[PDB]
Design a protein around this ligand. Structure first.
Ligand SMILES: Cn1nnc(-c2ccc3c(c2)[nH]c2nc(Cc4ccccc4)nc(N[C@H]4CC[C@H](N)CC4)c23)n1
Ligand SMILES: Cn1nnc(-c2ccc3c(c2)[nH]c2nc(Cc4ccccc4)nc(N[C@H]4CC[C@H](N)CC4)c23)n1
Ligand SMILES: [Zn+2]
Ligand SMILES: [Zn+2]
Lengths: 352, 365, 365, 352
């Protein structure tokens, strides 16, 4: 029941020399397709480039009117608004900045629509995973936030949606965009403490009618699979039974594994394959997006088998010519009496 | 036990009194001598009890009219002034003369201090002097003395450090990226700006004490990087948050100098503070001594002392053991090897023996 | 001056050595006596130099075969053990005997310590003993000893304090409101929960050290209220943030005991710490001594000591000057007046001399 | 040009025994009218009770549907939403909770409409001044935020509005309701540092397109008029010339004077009369609302002459029988080199 959405030329927009984020992450991910049998058993599609009218449902119209203008030129005129939208320094400006994000969110809402008509029950669009962007500004190399648009698309057909993010960085925009609403359940497993987002603490949960409608797991350095899976599975096992939901969204950040640049965690090969697999047992409809990921080699090799675990067919460890596809899981400051404490805190918060 | 029936009353003032009264009642108003010492015909009324209690040779000597030859009168006067008052204003002229006799007369403290003096200014049963002399072999007649900032490193740099030849520079597009110019490293798992990158070889590792956060707050956190395993582990925090502070290592201990501190609950004021991190005990403390010069200082380590330069042509020596400053006279940055001051506003080695200088930007360290 | 030519080398170890060697070479391996002391026929080889350096009476005595009458042999043995080793395990039986002679022989430290002993356990030129004896006039044959929690005070209470009869309670609908039950006050200009409300009469004021914030963070801030002008001024901050810690005053100094501290960057763990705020110098420090009992402790001040109760029937004495604990044996709360332990879970005065107790909730203070 | 709006029975809704906020503050304020000549020279009006349809322009419909239900009863049923809207503990529930706020915002928008037709150029409605409330929750005894509704009313006729608050507590809702927008300039002079709002620091200014469109002045204890006026006047003198605005809103908190319960500042009689007077010189249209204020005696005596200074006629110091009407201005931790530092910081931020 796999309907895999692959953008034809997503990996054609450069991001900068020696720049952390790499739009080639998704190309090298699926570009083991020259000897990939699963594609015969998979329905491959192409995404429809989303228009500004669909994107302005949440983003302020001025933001979209701004976004469709930037280029390697046309910066001096907008230098008074470039600093009013946070673009330029952290999230830079590259060629086709209004094309890559537009097509990614188009694919995301295409999968959302496909699930909306009960056509299929699982849909993956690895070109999503931009959860940092906000209503009026961009942050964390995320200009257009696909997750929020997909959730808005599902908000009418379904009244209860999950967002599960195992990305190292906290999902702020994907949480602020529905903070006050009581319809969406956001869950993020992030490193707190003088890290990038600076938010998503243990205490910043809910707002007004959206009170308690959020879950944050602040981890630390050197987490391992033997504890990460045991601390991760019961959170969904509890939230699903306590939310009586309709559909889920699976943001799978592949920067949360070993050897990743800017990646503090250290997860094994099969340790990562517990979010894309244990989520399937719940039998609910599911979007699947991919977020940030660096160290192209490992972020792609580990990504190869995410689809396989999402479709339930084992891919032999000896991969094609297109070295091996195995990794290792240093110290672990995540004391068991600390992770257990946070797990109990989350369990007590959800029961409220 | 119960203080209302019986308890042990130990006092730290007793030592101070049994020192001060002893000092006051011998060098002045000589009394209870009971011994007469001959120093090339000079008659001394050296009291018996005080001696032998520090020099065992005098115990052996006075275990049931003396000669004590092969001793300089002035050096013996200095020795008596020590043994009686504990304070001696030593000079380089009378160093070796005060050295050999002191190792003879079982004076551990003076032995150590003259060994340190000889190792600093450049035979007996001590290793410190022998190792110090052996280390002075590069000039008896392989690595760059100091690493500037020939490479380019176009990536933006906000911190650098050395570990013996391996230039580990924090930088890149995102500062967490760590570049190695030995002859890449584990990502820094913290968002820091103006963090002090100490490199203590005694417990070989790289420490990132202090810094600023993305929320514009001062980071009182220390995280260390193990060299042999690329493990960015975390250690005990600091006592006072700082940023852009000078750092210098000395026999394991890491000294954090100056920087900026939290002022008026919202801003940063230049600080004049001394912080010590014991890379063996893993404990932090703040020394009561306060630097005369505050601001953005750069420190260098020379022998057993540390030169500090903050603002202007005034360099401030610092002996951690003696807790005293020399305050010599002459934005600069001091680099001590084989000292040398470099001017930041580039619009020259130093000799500290006579305070005489010879004449011959981002991160000089 | 310049360390490479000449400098002053002062050592704090010199006093320690001139104490330890003196102690080791008299009480054992007696040598260089030079004096013979008669104590009811007991012959003592008391060395001359050590004496007179602490007791001026022995200086006068030995300024160019002794009697020294009107002295107890055992008390003189104790005196010699002091003068030679500084450590004496005094007992209540030999207090007065060791007192009168010590004021005679110009022993300031022992004079003070026996004066403190007599003032604690209950003629000469000292005021401390005279004032202590005068203060013991309430029992030679006006104010409530301790204020419970007869009024109602329906307003919610989170902290209270006493200043001699004026029950100043933080509370109300909003905690900042301050109610006075003397025999209203300036609003507290801070949002605090579980703040320590000390009342130091020496610099008469009310201090609000420590607390929790509305953002669920620990407050390392001290703000004081001047009694005579209703001025909620602000003083120097603490060193470690705490909340719900016990507080006790002693001759100006304010001692902050235990409480909760920041654990794992998000939670609060029970703490066993000693903090001192000098209400005259306006400086804070943390004592190296750590309480054996941690948690939610309640402290009371008795004479020159502090009783602390944390969890169970074990009370922990604390002498701030001696930095030692008695650790007697027997959630409770200690209230020391004229001591008395009260059980919080109410589902009895104390005598510390023999650790014997007699038998006869929100904020007992 | 005075058009004074006085609610007939605003002071008829109790707030609780020994409770800090007192709805009688506004009654005793104008209830020196038995010998108050200025009323003959003033046009007194009555406010129209605002309907829910007008209030739901910003507040979420669920919030207003909730608000019109609470009473001394009907609490157990909403006990699951009472904690989802922050009501009950800090901001309690009293009789006519949906009447006092409704009439106050009705008067506020009545003054807004009167200024909107160029009828008059100054309008005072002391029943406003609820700037703590938020889109989905209530805070600081503020259920319905009148300022936000008035600013929304003016947002169509005028494209640039000021909000100036000299209340001790930071104005959060009046700032969050237009945080991302670039149309309204908010300015609040508050005590920061473990105080009630916990927000409005020196650094929390702007959001996205609303970047730098906010101004926060964190003061400290024991401020005096001789420095407060000198530090206060140039802020408006700069912001007006730098904003090219249309209309202003003057939130006048009378808890910012001496002897006030929960009031740390210490201001004199004529020291307070520099916001209601120096604002008039700018010649722009102005709303005038009154915020929190306690210690009924002083908060009313000092309020008596605010209207007089707003109309430019001196009222003799010997007031009627309906003791004196004079106060005093302890220590001052507001170091001049700190207030000067913050003033320079604000001046440099506004120029951006
Ligand atoms: C998903 N993801 N992957 N990588 C990142 C990411 C992206 C960016 C940064 C980052 C991580 N860590 C960082 N640390 C610093 C150090 C610093 C501390 C205190 C004050 C200033 C700077 N500055 C960063 N950028 C600045 C932000 C302000 C802007 N005006 C210029 C660019 C970033 N997110
Ligand atoms: C314009 N204006 N005038 N006065 C106020 C105002 C209003 C309220 C408070 C306040 C000031 N200061 C306060 N301090 C505390 C102490 C505290 C510290 C840390 C954790 C908890 C409490 N708790 C307050 N209320 C609680 C809030 C949580 C709720 N569950 C119960 C009620 C308030 N606003
Ligand atoms: Zn990420
Ligand atoms: Zn207020």
């Amino acid at each position: 029941k796999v309907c895999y959405y692959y953008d034809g030329d997503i990996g054609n927009y450069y991001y900068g020399q020696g720049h952390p984020m790499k739009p080639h992450r998704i190309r090298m991910t699926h570009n083991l397709l020259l000897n990939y049998g699963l594609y015969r058993k998979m329905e491959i599609y192409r995404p429809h480039k989303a228009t500004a009218e669909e994107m302005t449902k949440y983003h302020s119209d001025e933001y979209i009117k701004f976004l469709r203008s930037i280029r390697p030129d046309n910066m001096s005129e907008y230098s008074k608004q470039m600093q009013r939208f946070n673009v330029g320094e952290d999230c830079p400006v590259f060629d086709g900045l209004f094309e890559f994000c537009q097509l990614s969110t188009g694919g995301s809402v295409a999968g959302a629509v496909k699930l909306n008509r009960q056509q299929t029950d699982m849909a993956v669009n690895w070109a999503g995973g931009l959860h940092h962007a906000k209503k009026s500004e961009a942050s964390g190399f995320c200009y257009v936030n696909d997750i929020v648009l997909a959730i808005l698309e599902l908000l009418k057909y379904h009244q209860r949606v999950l967002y599960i993010d195992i990305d190292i960085h906290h999902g702020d925009g994907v949480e602020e965009a529905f903070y006050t609403t009581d319809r969406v359940m956001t869950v993020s497993f992030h490193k707190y403490g003088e890290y990038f987002p600076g938010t998503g603490d243990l205490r910043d949960i809910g707002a007004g009618k959206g009170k308690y409608y959020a879950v944050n797991f602040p981890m630390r350095d050197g987490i391992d699979d033997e504890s990460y899976g045991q601390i991760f599975k019961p959170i969904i096992s509890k939230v699903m039974e306590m939310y009586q939901p309709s559909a889920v969204v699976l943001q799978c950040g592949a920067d949360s594994l070993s050897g990743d640049r800017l990646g503090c965690f250290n997860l094994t090969v099969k340790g990562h394959a517990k979010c894309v697999e244990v989520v399937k047992t719940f039998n609910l409809p599911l979007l699947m997006l991919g977020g940030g990921g660096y160290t192209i080699r490992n972020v792609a090799r580990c990504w190869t088998y995410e689809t396989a675990v999402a479709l339930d067919c084992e891919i032999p460890n000896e991969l094609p010519y297109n070295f091996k596809l195995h990794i290792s899981p240093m110290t672990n400051q995540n004391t068991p009496e600390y992770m257990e404490k946070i797990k109990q805190r989350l369990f007590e918060n959800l029961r409220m | 036990e119960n203080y209302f029936v019986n308890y042990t009353f130990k006092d730290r003032s007793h030592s101070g009194r049994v020192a001060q009264g002893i000092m006051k009642l011998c060098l002045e108003e000589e009394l209870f001598a009971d011994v007469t010492i001959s120093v090339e015909g000079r008659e001394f009324q050296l009291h018996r009890l005080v001696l032998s209690a520090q020099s065992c040779f005098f115990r052996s000597m006075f275990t049931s009219v003396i000669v004590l030859q092969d001793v300089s009168e002035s050096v013996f006067q200095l020795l008596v002034d020590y043994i009686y008052h504990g304070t001696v204003k030593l000079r380089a002229e009378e160093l070796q003369e005060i050295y050999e006799v002191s190792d003879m007369y079982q004076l551990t403290s003076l032995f150590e201090e003259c060994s340190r003096f000889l190792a600093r200014t450049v035979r007996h049963s001590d290793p410190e002097l022998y190792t110090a002399a052996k280390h002075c072999a590069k000039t008896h007649l392989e690595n760059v003395h100091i690493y500037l900032i020939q490479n380019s490193l176009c990536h933006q740099i906000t911190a650098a450090c050395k570990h013996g030849g391996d230039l580990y520079v924090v930088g890149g597009s995102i500062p967490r990226r760590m570049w190695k110019c030995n002859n890449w490293c584990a990502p820094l798992p913290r968002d820091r700006l103006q963090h002090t990158l100490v490199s203590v070889p005694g417990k070989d590792a790289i420490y990132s004490l202090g810094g600023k956060t993305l929320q514009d707050t001062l980071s009182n956190a220390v995280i260390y990087y193990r060299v042999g395993d690329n493990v960015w582990t975390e250690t005990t925090q600091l006592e006072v948050a700082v940023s852009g502070a000078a750092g210098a290592n000395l026999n394991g201990i890491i000294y954090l100098l100056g920087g900026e501190e939290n002022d008026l609950d919202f801003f940063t004021k230049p600080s004049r503070l001394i912080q010590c991190f014991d890379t063996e005990t893993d404990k932090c403390h703040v020394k009561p001594y306060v630097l005369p010069f505050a601001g953005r200082m750069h420190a260098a380590v020379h022998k057993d002392l540390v030169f500090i330069v903050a603002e202007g042509d005034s360099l401030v020596c610092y002996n951690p053991l003696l807790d005293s400053f020399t305050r010599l006279c002459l934005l600069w940055k001091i680099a001590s090897c084989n000292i040398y001051v470099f001017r930041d506003r580039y619009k020259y080695k130093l000799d500290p023996a006579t305070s005489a200088v010879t004449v011959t930007l981002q991160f000089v360290l």
